[PDB]
Amino acid sequence: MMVISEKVRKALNDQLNREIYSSYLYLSMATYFDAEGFKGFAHWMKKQAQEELTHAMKFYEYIYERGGRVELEAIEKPPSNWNGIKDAFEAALKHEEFVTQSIYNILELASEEKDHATVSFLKWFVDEQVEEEDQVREILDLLEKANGQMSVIFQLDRYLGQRE
Amino acid sequence: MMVISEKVRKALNDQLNREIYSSYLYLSMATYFDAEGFKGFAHWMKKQAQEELTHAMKFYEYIYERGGRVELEAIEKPPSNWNGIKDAFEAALKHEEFVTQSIYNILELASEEKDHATVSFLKWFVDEQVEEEDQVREILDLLEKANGQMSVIFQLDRYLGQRE
Amino acid sequence: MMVISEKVRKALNDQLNREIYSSYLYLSMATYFDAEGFKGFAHWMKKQAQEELTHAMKFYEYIYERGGRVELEAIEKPPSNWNGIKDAFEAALKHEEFVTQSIYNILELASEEKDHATVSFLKWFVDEQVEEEDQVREILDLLEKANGQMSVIFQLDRYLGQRE
Amino acid sequence: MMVISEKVRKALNDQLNREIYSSYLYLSMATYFDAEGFKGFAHWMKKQAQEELTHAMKFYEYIYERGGRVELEAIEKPPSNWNGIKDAFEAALKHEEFVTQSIYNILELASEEKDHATVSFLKWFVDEQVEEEDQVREILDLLEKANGQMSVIFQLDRYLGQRE
Amino acid sequence: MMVISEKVRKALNDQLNREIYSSYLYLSMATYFDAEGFKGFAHWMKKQAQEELTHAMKFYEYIYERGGRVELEAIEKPPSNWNGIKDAFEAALKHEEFVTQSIYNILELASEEKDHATVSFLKWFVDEQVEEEDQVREILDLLEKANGQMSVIFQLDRYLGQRE
Amino acid sequence: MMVISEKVRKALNDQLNREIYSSYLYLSMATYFDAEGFKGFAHWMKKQAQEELTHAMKFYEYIYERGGRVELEAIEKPPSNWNGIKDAFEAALKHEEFVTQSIYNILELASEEKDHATVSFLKWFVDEQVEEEDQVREILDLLEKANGQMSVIFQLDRYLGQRE
Ligand SMILES: [Ca+2]
Ligand SMILES: [Ca+2]
Ligand SMILES: [Ca+2]
Ligand SMILES: [Ca+2]
Ligand SMILES: [Ca+2]
Ligand SMILES: [Ca+2]
Ligand SMILES: [Ca+2]
Ligand SMILES: [Fe+3]
Ligand SMILES: [Fe+3]
Ligand SMILES: [Fe+3]
Ligand SMILES: [Fe+3]
Ligand SMILES: [Fe+3]
Ligand SMILES: [Fe+3]
Ligand SMILES: [Fe+3]
Ligand SMILES: [Fe+3]
Ligand SMILES: [Fe+3]
Ligand SMILES: [Fe+3]
Ligand SMILES: [Fe+3]
Ligand SMILES: [Fe+3]
């Protein structure tokens, strides 16, 4: 039997599909950075796309552990172009903040239903969104300092290109 | 400057998006196998989904190597249900055969344009599809022989669950 | 001096004795499986009994860390017979769900008292109960596929019999 | 089929439940030592509790080895308050001597029925009881010599807290 | 941009400065223990002072991760004398309970604002205050047993002087 | 019995408290570098804050070695903002030179009282201050040559961020 409500299952399944789109959106940013010839920024975005899949699969696992089932939905076409490196990371930040609020909405839903298991499960994502948002903000602040200057941009590209 | 034609770039880009859908489809099969309590078959499908992403990234890399750009498209909602283990693997064989013909069409289009670079590049995928189809056929033959004997199905699930 | 309320200390002490009974209940299931000649299912239940003692000792330590004292209560006699292997694991699942709800009751009591320490302490058990219930549901699902087939049940017995 | 008599099976089963109570009694002494702030004495009692469970499981194995079956009974509530350190260990000695006589009674019963297998099996517990009693007598003699001296009690607590 | 409210930022910053004062308070207790010739107690306090600084730096990091800024405030002069070792640990316990309640007040503030990131971040400190209070309570209980006796106090001094 | 004069003990104690303030000042400079997004400069200041604590503890241990006692005093609130990176390090140089003169003043006071042990103890701090001032002057020189060039400032931030 399923021991999460259908409302909570739908919220979690929706979020899993949102993590899939996040992976896809960051791959799309990679296609933009590669088109612009910044392979280190593109590498960072390919690593980011893989990271989002690990998020999706943690939602996947929990849904089945609570007796639910995962339904994959259509993935919408992401944008494929941004107006410079900074613009792409600014869209990344607005996306991560939207993901954070999406996760907050599940937490308050599960809290209202006294679904302590799901509330507790979501703590890891609450903490991970803090780091996710900070990692983008950190890059945005370095890009602000870089201004338009290619010598600094190249430094960031090499540094981000080392992401493990 | 792009040294593949736009027609070949489009066909390669379509195939990249088709490998992405292939990954999504096999994840969908995993959701079905997990829902049915067959974690070993689900594990195999999750590994298959990752194998398809390596195919997509090989197309990704070739497109940029020839001066083109990748555009990610919407990904259709995959089926989420099958009438049994055999039915899902039969659908996988059909999907792989379709991928093989899709690759064939690019090969023939590249050949008519005398794009020997792309023709040569696709040889890897031609040989990989022979193996991809064979690996599903092998599993189908095992399921056929098992008939419906759960004891043998349990062993197959465990075996496929050891996929590296 | 004690820094949990007496109401919370009693709720935690009750839950400790509840975990001791759970251990005893699972050892009793071991006596049934050994009586039926399923040493692998018995082995799994003996490991489960030890696992419940580790739960009891975690409540033990926290009670003393909060300046409380533990008082052991009489342990009721458990059932010693079930109507087949599946009926015993169904009894185990229902028992775990009652354990989960008992823990939820402590969590809501502590939360009402603004005993943030005990609320936080109980998160570990909220998460463990997710896993505890899932581990039983997984065996139940495998038993349902086994139907009655001794060839399948032999496989399950040897698989569970290797639990570490 | 069972090759011990029911009278011998019941006696062995009674002793198994008696060893479970012994383990519970020693855990209760630990709750007392922990309440009094003697973690080393409490550690010794937790170790003793686990040692008693190995005794119970030896009776468990032997009962099934002779075709019998184990029935777990209710476990009585142990005392939880002693006058002081030495009184707890004196209660342990009297309990171990009661356990020894209880084993003597099974030996004489099995001997009267010419159940030489059960008589032989019990030799290990006879020899183990000599050591069990001796190990408590040694601690009692240290506590008697200590008289009330807290500095000695501290060293004894620390020594016993090292039990493997 | 700062994604904690100014009310929560100020509560976190206040607490950072309280952990700094806590470090300075324990260093002062070390100056007292060293003046009294108890180098083991002094060593424990120097280690405690470093431990408090790790708490301050965790608040520091989280404030910057949420886009806030740390402002260091004046540090008040601590007491430098106590009426014996036991009086000093009584003051330590009083101080830790005040730190615990200070953390609870932040938790309830962030909960009221639905600042789930800060609520979750604070769980680590809720759990650590449980241990912090218990470690002082333990030493106080042993000093109560010691009464005045130098033979017991020398044991505590050398044991605490092994703190890593 | 204290074998330094009270005047020398107070001068040594004043200096200990000034090394504590130095630590706190450098931590405040870290808060400023972190606010400005230069984590490598902040790291260097955090390491510098720890170094000043080792200076404080050397004064601590010598005071007790000579039979004296340490009294911790209030710590003034440090500045928390500077007019750029160079302005912060110039405040650091000025503070280090003030620390050197402060040490010179103790040396001359002890020399006047013929406290050869304290004069000799201070030689280490005389030599360390030479290095301390020079390490700041070296960074100031690199900043002067860097002028405003963000490209160079990025490299200096990363270099100083390697400080062990
Ligand atoms: Ca990340
Ligand atoms: Ca393959
Ligand atoms: Ca388990
Ligand atoms: Ca023994
Ligand atoms: Ca710890
Ligand atoms: Ca601690
Ligand atoms: Ca230095
Ligand atoms: Fe994510
Ligand atoms: Fe993300
Ligand atoms: Fe493929
Ligand atoms: Fe394929
Ligand atoms: Fe449990
Ligand atoms: Fe359980
Ligand atoms: Fe025994
Ligand atoms: Fe015994
Ligand atoms: Fe602290
Ligand atoms: Fe503390
Ligand atoms: Fe210094
Ligand atoms: Fe300095």
Numbering used by the authors:
A (entry chain C), B (entry chain F), C (entry chain D), D (entry chain A), E (entry chain B), F (entry chain H): 1 to 164
Text taken from the publication that reported this structure:
Consistent with these recent findings, our results show that, in solution, purified TmFtn molecules exist as dimers and can self-assemble into 24-meric hollow protein nanocage in the presence of Ca2+, and addition of EDTA causes the formed protein nanocage disassembly back into its dimeric form, indicative of a reversible process of protein assembly. The crystal structure of 24-meric Tmftn determined at a resolution of 2.2 Å shows that one calcium ion located nearby C3–C4 interface is coordinated with two acidic residues (Glu51 and Glu132) and three water molecules. This might be an important reason why TmFtn molecules naturally exist as protein dimers in solution in the absence of metal ions. In contrast, calcium ions near the C3–C4 interface can essentially eliminate such electrostatic repulsion through their interaction with the acidic residues, strengthening the stability of C3–C4 interface, finally producing the 24-meric protein nanocage. Besides, each protein nanocage is composed of 12 protein dimers, and any of the 2 adjacent protein dimers interact with each other in a head-to-side manner. In contrast, native TmFtn exhibits a different packing pattern in its crystal where 12 TmFtn dimers assemble into a 24-mer protein cage.
Four helix bundles are also attractive for synthetic chemists because its interfaces are dominated by side chain and side chain interactions, which can be more tunable than β-strands. This study focuses on TmFtn, a naturally dimeric protein consisting of two antiparallel four helix bundles, as shown in Supplementary Fig. 1. Thermotoga maritima ferritin (TmFtn) naturally occurs as a dimer; twelve of these dimers interact with each other in a head-to-side manner to generate 24-meric hollow protein nanocage in the presence of Ca2+ or PEG. By tuning two contiguous dimeric proteins to interact in a fully or partially side-by-side fashion through protein interface redesign, we can render the self-assembly transformation of such dimeric building blocks from the protein nanocage to filament, nanorod and nanoribbon in response to multiple external stimuli.
